[PDB]
Enzyme design. Structure first.
Site, PDB file in Angstrom:
ATOM      1  N   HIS D  53       0.887  -1.162   0.000  1.00 24.88           N
ATOM      2  CA  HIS D  53       0.000   0.000   0.000  1.00 24.88           C
ATOM      3  C   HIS D  53       0.925   1.212   0.000  1.00 24.88           C
ATOM      4  O   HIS D  53       1.990   1.157   0.642  1.00 24.88           O
ATOM      5  CB  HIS D  53      -0.838   0.132   1.276  1.00 24.88           C
ATOM      6  CG  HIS D  53      -1.819  -0.962   1.480  1.00 24.88           C
ATOM      7  ND1 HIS D  53      -1.495  -2.123   2.136  1.00 24.88           N
ATOM      8  CD2 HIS D  53      -3.129  -1.075   1.130  1.00 24.88           C
ATOM      9  CE1 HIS D  53      -2.538  -2.931   2.128  1.00 24.88           C
ATOM     10  NE2 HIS D  53      -3.538  -2.327   1.513  1.00 24.88           N
ATOM     11  N   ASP D  56       2.366   1.852   3.447  1.00 21.78           N
ATOM     12  CA  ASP D  56       3.304   0.843   3.986  1.00 21.78           C
ATOM     13  C   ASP D  56       4.716   1.291   3.642  1.00 21.78           C
ATOM     14  O   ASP D  56       5.651   0.982   4.363  1.00 21.78           O
ATOM     15  CB  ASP D  56       3.126  -0.535   3.349  1.00 21.78           C
ATOM     16  CG  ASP D  56       1.768  -1.133   3.588  1.00 21.78           C
ATOM     17  OD1 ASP D  56       1.314  -1.924   2.712  1.00 21.78           O
ATOM     18  OD2 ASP D  56       1.163  -0.852   4.666  1.00 21.78           O
ATOM     19  N   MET D  87       2.532  -5.809  -7.960  1.00 24.02           N
ATOM     20  CA  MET D  87       1.214  -5.266  -7.627  1.00 24.02           C
ATOM     21  C   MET D  87       1.369  -4.234  -6.512  1.00 24.02           C
ATOM     22  O   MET D  87       2.298  -4.315  -5.663  1.00 24.02           O
ATOM     23  CB  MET D  87       0.257  -6.376  -7.194  1.00 24.02           C
ATOM     24  CG  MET D  87      -1.135  -5.887  -6.825  1.00 24.02           C
ATOM     25  SD  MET D  87      -1.281  -5.395  -5.048  1.00 24.02           S
ATOM     26  CE  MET D  87      -1.503  -7.033  -4.298  1.00 24.02           C
ATOM     27  N   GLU D 180     -10.568  -6.237  -5.350  1.00 19.99           N
ATOM     28  CA  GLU D 180     -10.549  -7.284  -4.327  1.00 19.99           C
ATOM     29  C   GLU D 180     -11.845  -7.256  -3.511  1.00 19.99           C
ATOM     30  O   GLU D 180     -12.033  -6.337  -2.674  1.00 19.99           O
ATOM     31  CB  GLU D 180      -9.362  -7.097  -3.419  1.00 19.99           C
ATOM     32  CG  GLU D 180      -9.288  -8.121  -2.296  1.00 19.99           C
ATOM     33  CD  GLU D 180      -7.934  -8.140  -1.607  1.00 19.99           C
ATOM     34  OE1 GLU D 180      -6.946  -7.581  -2.142  1.00 19.99           O
ATOM     35  OE2 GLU D 180      -7.851  -8.714  -0.503  1.00 19.99           O
ATOM     36  N   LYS D 182     -14.792  -8.241  -0.725  1.00 17.91           N
ATOM     37  CA  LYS D 182     -14.892  -8.677   0.652  1.00 17.91           C
ATOM     38  C   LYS D 182     -16.325  -8.394   1.090  1.00 17.91           C
ATOM     39  O   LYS D 182     -16.885  -7.360   0.752  1.00 17.91           O
ATOM     40  CB  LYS D 182     -13.900  -7.944   1.567  1.00 17.91           C
ATOM     41  CG  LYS D 182     -13.839  -8.480   3.016  1.00 17.91           C
ATOM     42  CD  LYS D 182     -12.767  -7.796   3.889  1.00 17.91           C
ATOM     43  CE  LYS D 182     -12.590  -8.499   5.232  1.00 17.91           C
ATOM     44  NZ  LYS D 182     -11.790  -7.704   6.245  1.00 17.91           N
ATOM     45  N   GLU D 216      -9.730 -13.112  -2.817  1.00 17.21           N
ATOM     46  CA  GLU D 216      -8.987 -13.644  -1.627  1.00 17.21           C
ATOM     47  C   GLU D 216      -9.724 -14.844  -1.062  1.00 17.21           C
ATOM     48  O   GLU D 216     -10.958 -14.790  -0.842  1.00 17.21           O
ATOM     49  CB  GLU D 216      -8.851 -12.556  -0.547  1.00 17.21           C
ATOM     50  CG  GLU D 216      -7.988 -13.008   0.631  1.00 17.21           C
ATOM     51  CD  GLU D 216      -7.898 -11.954   1.773  1.00 17.21           C
ATOM     52  OE1 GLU D 216      -7.513 -10.827   1.507  1.00 17.21           O
ATOM     53  OE2 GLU D 216      -8.255 -12.254   2.910  1.00 17.21           O
ATOM     54  N   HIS D 219     -11.954 -14.241   1.937  1.00 15.00           N
ATOM     55  CA  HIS D 219     -13.092 -13.344   1.736  1.00 15.00           C
ATOM     56  C   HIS D 219     -14.333 -14.017   1.164  1.00 15.00           C
ATOM     57  O   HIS D 219     -15.424 -13.761   1.650  1.00 15.00           O
ATOM     58  CB  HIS D 219     -12.728 -12.133   0.906  1.00 15.00           C
ATOM     59  CG  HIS D 219     -11.737 -11.234   1.581  1.00 15.00           C
ATOM     60  ND1 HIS D 219     -11.191 -10.147   0.950  1.00 15.00           N
ATOM     61  CD2 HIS D 219     -11.161 -11.293   2.809  1.00 15.00           C
ATOM     62  CE1 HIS D 219     -10.300  -9.575   1.751  1.00 15.00           C
ATOM     63  NE2 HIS D 219     -10.280 -10.238   2.896  1.00 15.00           N
ATOM     64  N   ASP D 244      -5.181 -13.628  -4.149  1.00 15.22           N
ATOM     65  CA  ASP D 244      -4.714 -13.434  -2.776  1.00 15.22           C
ATOM     66  C   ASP D 244      -4.966 -14.781  -2.043  1.00 15.22           C
ATOM     67  O   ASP D 244      -6.148 -15.249  -1.905  1.00 15.22           O
ATOM     68  CB  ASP D 244      -5.579 -12.444  -2.007  1.00 15.22           C
ATOM     69  CG  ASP D 244      -5.002 -11.132  -1.780  1.00 15.22           C
ATOM     70  OD1 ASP D 244      -4.051 -10.679  -2.433  1.00 15.22           O
ATOM     71  OD2 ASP D 244      -5.615 -10.491  -0.905  1.00 15.22           O
ATOM     72  N   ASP D 254     -12.317 -11.885   9.501  1.00 17.95           N
ATOM     73  CA  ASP D 254     -11.325 -12.186   8.474  1.00 17.95           C
ATOM     74  C   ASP D 254     -10.068 -12.621   9.243  1.00 17.95           C
ATOM     75  O   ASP D 254      -9.400 -11.797   9.879  1.00 17.95           O
ATOM     76  CB  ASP D 254     -11.157 -10.916   7.648  1.00 17.95           C
ATOM     77  CG  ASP D 254     -10.189 -11.048   6.484  1.00 17.95           C
ATOM     78  OD1 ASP D 254      -9.489 -10.042   6.226  1.00 17.95           O
ATOM     79  OD2 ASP D 254     -10.113 -12.114   5.840  1.00 17.95           O
ATOM     80  N   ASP D 256      -7.221 -14.334   7.956  1.00 20.92           N
ATOM     81  CA  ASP D 256      -5.959 -14.216   7.185  1.00 20.92           C
ATOM     82  C   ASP D 256      -4.878 -15.182   7.713  1.00 20.92           C
ATOM     83  O   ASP D 256      -3.713 -14.794   7.923  1.00 20.92           O
ATOM     84  CB  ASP D 256      -5.398 -12.771   7.240  1.00 20.92           C
ATOM     85  CG  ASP D 256      -6.223 -11.771   6.414  1.00 20.92           C
ATOM     86  OD1 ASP D 256      -7.067 -12.148   5.574  1.00 20.92           O
ATOM     87  OD2 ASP D 256      -5.991 -10.554   6.621  1.00 20.92           O
ATOM     88  N   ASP D 286      -1.829 -12.920   1.284  1.00 22.59           N
ATOM     89  CA  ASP D 286      -2.328 -11.826   2.118  1.00 22.59           C
ATOM     90  C   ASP D 286      -2.704 -12.453   3.444  1.00 22.59           C
ATOM     91  O   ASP D 286      -3.829 -12.880   3.639  1.00 22.59           O
ATOM     92  CB  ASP D 286      -3.547 -11.121   1.480  1.00 22.59           C
ATOM     93  CG  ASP D 286      -3.982  -9.916   2.299  1.00 22.59           C
ATOM     94  OD1 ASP D 286      -5.033  -9.291   1.977  1.00 22.59           O
ATOM     95  OD2 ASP D 286      -3.286  -9.611   3.323  1.00 22.59           O
TER      96      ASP D 286
HETATM   97 CA   LIG Z   1      -8.584 -10.962   4.436  1.00 22.50          CA
HETATM   98 MG   LIG Z   2      -6.321  -9.497   0.435  1.00 18.78          MG
END
Ligand SMILES: [Ca+2]
Ligand SMILES: [Mg+2]
Ligand SMILES: [Ca+2]
Ligand SMILES: [Ca+2]
Ligand SMILES: [Ca+2]
Ligand SMILES: [Cl-]
Ligand SMILES: [Cl-]
Ligand SMILES: [Cl-]
Ligand SMILES: [Cl-]
Ligand SMILES: [Mg+2]
Ligand SMILES: [Mg+2]
Ligand SMILES: [Mg+2]
Lengths: 386, 386, 386, 386
Positions: D53, D56, D87, D180, D182, D216, D219, D244, D254, D256, D286
């Site tokens: 991002h 980040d 990406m 993406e 969600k 993802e 998700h 993802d 979520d 992850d 991710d």
């Molecule tokens: Ca996630």
């Molecule tokens: Mg993701």
């Protein structure tokens, strides 16, 4: 209309209206509130009281002198407002030390620390007049299968609760404990995930009479369970020591919406049950004013919790009092449900040819239950469409 | 490889392999099976035994003479094969009379009928050698809030179970009861929806020692709960009298897939727990061969249940026996989890400055749990990638 | 109060009120209804019309002469009552031949048969005046991963829909197709599981203008999705050709409760959206009178669907018309949401220092959205507590 | 065994291994990582690259000079390691300004700001060599029904995406966008909640060829959907621009988890599909190393993602190559599924008496699909039990 007063016994956690809006993906949207301000504002709204985690009232790490001053100012706000503190709890989840749990941390030193932190706060809770001490084992659990032997963890949880019961007994305190179940979040699966699991666990404690449950609407709904049914069971067991009211839209992260939002009909049936059972404890809201809101919106959300409870109370009462509903309830045989199946005893049942050899199962099967008509009367009452 | 034998204690309900494939939206895809054929075919596959509902073995409405002949032929198949019948249960759900429940029907006559039907079958279960009698209250519940007062329904359920305990006691039978929880389907919400709710309920019965649970994998997974954790709690309580094995892909209708399908890692951790706890009862499969399958596919699905159990048993055993895993378990402090938090007692804990005043919380917090490394060792063992 | 009339455009499937109550675990609790009786009874309740699967109207296997007589009597009932038939559909799920699907069965002969069965019924649907032909691919899917290559299955589904579009075009029919998504049940996972998946698929068809969606409340709720949001998207796409109204309590088996039961607030926001968008199609109920009910309860449940729609319509209208709500909507900047972000264009946006270099992000962040006050106004309107 | 190399195209977000462990209920358990350190450590593990991002890589609020230095050092790490940046994406969710969304914020100034922040980062993404630009509309949605008119919000979302497509086109960039989806969290319901919704939306954009999806695992599983089926549909549409990978245990917050944890069989079928379709893009993880872990555990979790992918790749390949599996696939008619239903055309289908008048539906219905045997071959391959 539907104006709360302190006799309604509405209470709020300091952490509810004081939530700064930090979520897994976002920074705070609101400044911290002084607990004193929260007491004052809630009082103005008609609240009866507030609850606290140790660390909401006294910043983690405070000196004794700081601790004294934080409590003194809080007690002055309660005195200024007439607000009560019916319940308190320990923060065994925020500090990184509790990352694998408090009472059931794999590290023994952490378990001992968790107990000492709780005991310190029990003393404070008593001094503030609390009747109930809540335990929410939010970090007690696991994300992977090898990380926690659950039988060992339950042994640790029992040991912890047993020691806290010894402590309260040794000090002559009247306070009782209430376990707040939650199925997951922040751990992948949390131990004692439902009201049923907590009730069962309590029966294994050395002094089960000191422990009950503090069920939360959203938490049972996160397992897709029926909250009014869980509350009925807790009541049936004599263990509904406290209740946490909020809203939740289905199976997802813990939303903590204001009470009445989420599953509105479930809210209706809950208030119907609490009122008809004569539940006398605090009507406690554990809700998060959404992080979209500024401080005016915080107080609007809190007022809305109480308003929604009072509207539903009115509608449920009107439902139960309506002679057409009473007739419908008899048509649906709810009166028969409340009568003993076999007060005549086992032998009489065995000898009763009407119960088997001469039971007309096809006639019985053909009798409709009339539940749809009953349920539509319920909807018409809820919506004020009678 | 992984060939079942009767010493593995694999059992199947007659209703599993005998499922004709009728679903809410579809007609039967397979003809009915004679129970005799099912015993013979299962035996050939390495099964230990079978279980039955009353109505699986004896068609509802049968004369005494018909009843005698159905039982006689079934007993001959068991004798021909060496198959056992460790568990039986009552069908209190198929017949329209049970549309609002059996034991907790609002209609008193139906409740009495349900008890009489159960008692008749308990006698048969004993004659066939069953050690466990299962109750699955699949129609006990509601679709709407006014239709069932749950406290009244729990009073009825207790009365029912208490009468059945009186009956078994009066006859000198050694058989014990096991409640099979399910959260919903066919009713919108089912009473005693989880293992926790059933455990709690049992503690209110007059003779709690006669009752345990028969948890089903798919059923706890339908509430999104962790099945191995629920089983751990049942074991902790001394109440795992029987277990129902199958698969389920998440929160949806009850799929009853063959064991190992669905949540494979959860299956792994379950077999690990059962084997390490020394669970000695039947490994019972309550599964539905999908309606896509013909009779060859039925027997393939059943063989697959047993095969998957045996593969997971091997992998879990290899996991626990691996010195690198044992080291990882110590690194993750699972040994510490199994030690008492405060065997020194409450006063010593209170006086222990290392537990609070001198506890270095930042050092404790900085220690990683090493759970990811442990979990990857678990994955590598499951997949045979060591 | 809240009395339906045919101008409200309420319609019911024959299979709804005609549901005999057979569920996965239970036999029928009600006798079959003659479609003629259902038309007559619905008309008396204020309904506008009925819908049918081929096999609801004409028993599978009927001769041409039988077929003619079934249709003739049905048309007489419509003529006697003034009832319409706005929509029809094909039963590609009950008969065992469809156990692995219709259009996407692995067996090519079954796919061809499914198309021929559909085409026959399209001709009938047109003759009865239907404007919409629904496809519910309830058997299109899988319980295991190897059983269906989904890219191949989507190729087959496209081929099927493309052929049906050729057929309607070749005959000069005005009828349009509507796909009804469902995420699972009876298959473990169903293809095109949501409104989004169906919309996307439609854009790959040779004549996308002939196809829309027929979303069902319960079905999107079974994926835990927000039904009003899915409907908004379908409307945004110009594809809301029909809608199926019912209730559902969360993520579980497809309950098909009467409309308004289940998620009551979601029902409110749905009716608000349909009315404000000027949706002009049928308000179709796809509901199951619970199997607890006798025939009086069936008609009560159907009346309740319509009643609940009309109550919510009133409350939503009152909500939108209330000047205090209009003020709240402006306070929450809903008017701003409806204005273009950058009608000035990309270059002007790039050159606008107020959009970045001189944007005061802290002032923007501090502005509360006032959504809680807006939402409580919505609750007060729904409950008639203004 | 199963050692990753950069040719495997494994990539990680900086925010994954860099996650400090702050959750809704807990403070950070790990210090921040320098992106430079993360590049170096990932490279050592066999990774191909990293994603970011904007915030980040460059702390929100940085001066141009600070910005230059952060990028310079990052580019040196990539040069030192041979790591790529395939990406990038914009943080439109953390800062309180985005509390009601970015592109679909009700406040127009916020929408414009979100676009400007994205565009700035697109320029950077291109300079770093990214081929895909991800948009995750995590704040685009609502907790209450009146707060967002979804048709207006979709108009805003389209406007936003259309402007970004104009920008990339105007600059001659080759980069493409990937949405993406969600379904919820952090908003109560998120717009474009699934792969299907995102695909459908894309078809309304001015230049649909520039946009795809970045689905993802967790998700789609949060909606209880089948991830391999959604990926199949995206592939079928030609829109799988990126993926993802992670794990998730059912319908809840979520999680992850590292790839392979969660639903292991779903992971198997996903890798089978990606490999058989010849997906050539990044295998992007991710995931969140659980907050229980220290830095050694972080790197263990990341290594485990790659390891699990490679194990599953081996097993899926062995599955597809096994002559017994190939025979089973023919027995289950997967070859027939891949053939046209009616390449003969509509008229020939209509005239084919074998498709209807002379179709033997009972013979067709009696043919078992043999899916259980196929699925057990799949399980045996996954577990290395052949
Ligand atoms: Ca996630
Ligand atoms: Mg993701
Ligand atoms: Ca909560
Ligand atoms: Ca089951
Ligand atoms: Ca449905
Ligand atoms: Cl217990
Ligand atoms: Cl209880
Ligand atoms: Cl598509
Ligand atoms: Cl769309
Ligand atoms: Mg709470
Ligand atoms: Mg079972
Ligand atoms: Mg429908």
């Amino acid at each position: 209309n539907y104006q709360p007063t302190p006799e309604d016994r509405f209470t709020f956690g300091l952490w509810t209206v004081g939530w700064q809006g930090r979520d897994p993906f976002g920074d705070a949207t609101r400044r911290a509130l002084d607990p004193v301000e929260s007491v004052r504002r809630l009082a103005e709204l008609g609240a009866h009281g507030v609850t606290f985690h140790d660390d909401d009232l006294i910043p983690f790490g405070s000196s004794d002198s700081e601790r004294e001053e934080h409590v003194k100012r809080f007690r002055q706000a309660l005195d200024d407002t007439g607000m009560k503190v019916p319940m308190a709890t320990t923060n065994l989840f925020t500090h990184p030390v509790f990352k694998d749990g408090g009472f059931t941390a794999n590290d023994r030193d952490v378990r001992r620390y968790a107990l000492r932190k709780t005991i310190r706060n029990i003393d404070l809770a008593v001094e503030l007049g609390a009747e109930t001490y809540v335990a929410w084992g939010g970090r007690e659990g696991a994300e992977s299968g090898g990380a926690k032997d659950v039988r060992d963890a339950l042994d640790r949880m029992k040991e912890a609760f047993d020691l806290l019961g010894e402590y309260v007994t040794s000090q002559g305190y009247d306070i009782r404990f209430a376990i707040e179940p939650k199925p997951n979040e922040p751990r992948g699966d949390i131990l004692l995930p439902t009201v049923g699991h907590a009730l069962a666990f309590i029966e294994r404690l050395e002094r089960p009479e000191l422990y009950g449950v503090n069920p939360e609407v959203g938490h049972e709904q996160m397992a897709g369970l029926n909250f009014p049914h869980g509350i009925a069971q807790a009541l049936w067991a004599g263990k509904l020591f406290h209740i946490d009211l909020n809203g939740q839209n289905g199976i997802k992260y813990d939303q903590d919406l204001r009470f009445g939002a989420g599953d509105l009909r479930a809210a209706f049936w809950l208030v119907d049950l609490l009122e008809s059972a004569g539940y006398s404890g605090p009507r406690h809201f554990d809700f998060k004013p959404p992080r979209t809101e500024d401080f005016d919106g915080v107080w609007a959300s809190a007022a809305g919790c109480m308003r929604n409870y009072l509207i539903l109370k009115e509608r449920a009462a009107a439902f139960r009092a309506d002679p057409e509903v009473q007739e419908a309830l008899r048509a649906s045989r709810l009166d028969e449900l409340a009568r003993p199946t076999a007060a005549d005893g086992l032998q009489a049942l065995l000898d009763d040819r009407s119960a088997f050899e001469e039971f007309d199962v096809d006639a019985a099967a053909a009798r409709g239950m009339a539940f749809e008509r009953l349920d539509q009367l319920a909807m018409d009452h809820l919506l004020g469409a009678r």
